[PDB]
Amino acid sequence: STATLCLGHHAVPNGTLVKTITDDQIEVTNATELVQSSSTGKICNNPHRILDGIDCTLIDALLGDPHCDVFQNETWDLFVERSKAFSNCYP
Amino acid sequence: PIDTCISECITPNGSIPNDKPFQNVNKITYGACPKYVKQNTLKLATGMRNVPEK
Amino acid sequence: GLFGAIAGFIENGWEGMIDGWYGFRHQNSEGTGQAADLKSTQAAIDQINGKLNRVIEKTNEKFHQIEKEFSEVEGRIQDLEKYVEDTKIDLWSYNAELLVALENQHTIDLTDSEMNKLFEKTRRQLRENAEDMGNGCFKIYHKCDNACIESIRNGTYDHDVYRDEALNNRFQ
Amino acid sequence: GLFGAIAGFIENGWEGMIDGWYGFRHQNSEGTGQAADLKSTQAAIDQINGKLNRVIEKTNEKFHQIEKEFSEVEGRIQDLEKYVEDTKIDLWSYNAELLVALENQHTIDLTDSEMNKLFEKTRRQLRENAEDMGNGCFKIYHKCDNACIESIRNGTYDHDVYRDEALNNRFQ
Amino acid sequence: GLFGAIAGFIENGWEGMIDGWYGFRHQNSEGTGQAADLKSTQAAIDQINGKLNRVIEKTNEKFHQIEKEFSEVEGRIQDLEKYVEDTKIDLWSYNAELLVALENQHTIDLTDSEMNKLFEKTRRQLRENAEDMGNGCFKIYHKCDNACIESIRNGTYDHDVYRDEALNNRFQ
Ligand SMILES: *[C@@H]1O[C@H](CO)[C@@H](O[C@@H]2O[C@H](CO)[C@@H](O)[C@H](O)[C@H]2NC(C)=O)[C@H](O)[C@H]1NC(C)=O
Ligand SMILES: *[C@@H]1O[C@H](CO)[C@@H](O)[C@H](O)[C@H]1NC(C)=O
Ligand SMILES: *[C@@H]1O[C@H](CO)[C@@H](O)[C@H](O)[C@H]1NC(C)=O
Ligand SMILES: *[C@@H]1O[C@H](CO)[C@@H](O)[C@H](O)[C@H]1NC(C)=O
Ligand SMILES: *[C@@H]1O[C@H](CO)[C@@H](O)[C@H](O)[C@H]1NC(C)=O
């Protein structure tokens, strides 16, 4: 003689644990990571002008170290200075 | 190493995507980079509280 | 969980619900049926889709800064640089932690609020023809076929044409 | 909008209401009338009047600071000064943005809460003599003249002296 | 105080309540009795016990920093050190103030929410056998002895076995 109407909400078989003001760990249907913790390991050459300094430091390229002669009149947005860089001119 | 690709944010560890607001890769950054934090993970809830059956 | 709807009197999520976030399950003479409420689901999704661009609009663009790694030991200036960077890192880490906690708490309260709002709206449609059973489910006290149920879900339910039968069934 | 009262089941603001923020409109045999509820309006106004002095008590007083504009180029010290000032500016800009967003959200929830509280109080006064029509309006099931309506608004409504007539009208 | 339960329609705290935070007082034919609801009290206590470790996990460990007190007057470097320390102190003082205000507001809303949740749960158990008197107290319309009251408090109240008598008493 009667009908029944239930109200409910969706669930998921496995859920993500997040932290709130009142709970250290509470399970929710979905969650997004906000901290980027990994890198590709390579420097993209766009959109910034990247100047790879092979064996040269910025000061050595500035002064005009012979093995730095390829860096004359160079421009950069980011000068990438390598650990293998060394000086080979007057001390 | 340098690569042929597009990325706005460069760290000493390489280029990283800047879609996330925070990063834990390196405190040295260049470009449009996420803010550096000490936490390695921060989950933002994008759904309701999950109550499975049983 | 301020309203006690989700993880409250509802007591259970529906893993068979994939159409939306909030919806109805009905059992009547014809048989069991299920549907999703698009309006409440869309309200919750809209209130959740941003929620981080509204506080941190974009990544700030920084090009030339202080040095943050040092080979040798200078003294005052290196100490000041390290102190400045450490202070900035601590403050931003606290900001991130507090923001995430606040947003998660508000999102939980928000979804629970949408659930409670749907419940109250459905109750208000069923003025005297239904009774809350206390588990988030309404007992409707009249013949309510599929058209009746869809009218309830639609929002165009007409409580007047069933009021006599419903009152006769409830209060005998 | 956590309770679904404002921009919810109320569905509409009254531009003719200038006496207060929350109030009543009544239609009975005598005719239409309107009034404002001073207590709820005052509660909301009191909870809103400060709300910024409670977090930022006053302007801090700063007299001699670092230089923030430079003509020539020095190097380390100028870079450190620029970095410190930029870090401070970014942190305070984030603080301002987050504070404004949080306070606006709480103010909206607060006003919606006061509306819902007034609604629930009015419903509780009208124990069995009225029914919620679902649009924020009560159908009262007895002769309720202007004195009756003002008693409802006053808070001294006596549901017992109308209960017989109201039950007779509702359940027939 | 978003729900209007505490300092709302409840209107009064019970100083004789020491067993828990939330509870029941009942008056029937046998006599007055009082008990505490352990589940709601435990929910509120659990949501309050941390609430600061969830934002500030621990004290950060700092060993060697800049100098913050100076005997003589140097100039640029001392000014920069003072500016950095003052900026850090102001930002952390603001953080402390805002965090305390936010947590206090949420704690008040949380306890008020637990009170309202207990009230709604009790109302939903007493489907048609009781009426809300508007002061946080239910008038139950049937013989409800101590076993009946403890069943209400327990959660295993069976509204069906009293429904006839309760309807007969309410609607005459
Ligand atoms: C949780 O939300 C995320 C964010 O949208 C969803 O992840 C996306 O899912 C779609 C599926 O069509 C993919 O195309 C996207 O590439 C995903 N984005 C990311 C960043 O992973 C995810 O599906 C949601 N989870 C659930 C269970 O709904
Ligand atoms: C997903 O669900 C399965 C079972 O439903 C579970 O074993 C697993 O741990 C969950 N998470 C992932 C990441 O697979
Ligand atoms: C639902 O309501 C709309 C508008 O009142 C109507 O056009 C439609 O036919 C109804 N039924 C549905 C969508 O099944
Ligand atoms: C409203 O109530 C107060 C106190 O019960 C009473 O003094 C007053 O006469 C009532 N009517 C009004 C203010 O119109
Ligand atoms: C309360 O309910 C529980 C479980 O239904 C039952 O075991 C117990 O006897 C009841 N009465 C009490 C605890 O007085």
Residue numbers in the entry:
A (entry chain A): 9 to 99
B (entry chain A): 273 to 326
C (entry chain B), D (entry chain D), E (entry chain F): 1 to 172
Published text:
HA is a transmembrane viral surface protein which is responsible for interacting with host cell receptors and mediating virus entry. Triggered by the decrease in pH in late endosomes during virus entry, HA undergoes conformational changes that underlie its transition from a prefusion state to a postfusion state. Through initial biochemistry and cryo-EM data analyses, we found that F005-126, a neutralizing antibody targeting the HA head of H3N2 viruses, fulfills all our requirements.
We then determined the cryo-EM structures of the full-length HA in complex with Fab F005-126 at pH 7.8 and pH 5.2. Atomic models of the HA ectodomain and the bound Fabs were built. The N-terminal Helix Cs are tightly packed through extensive hydrophobic interactions. Unlike the canonical coiled coil, the C-terminal Helix Ds are loosely packed and do not have a hydrophobic core.
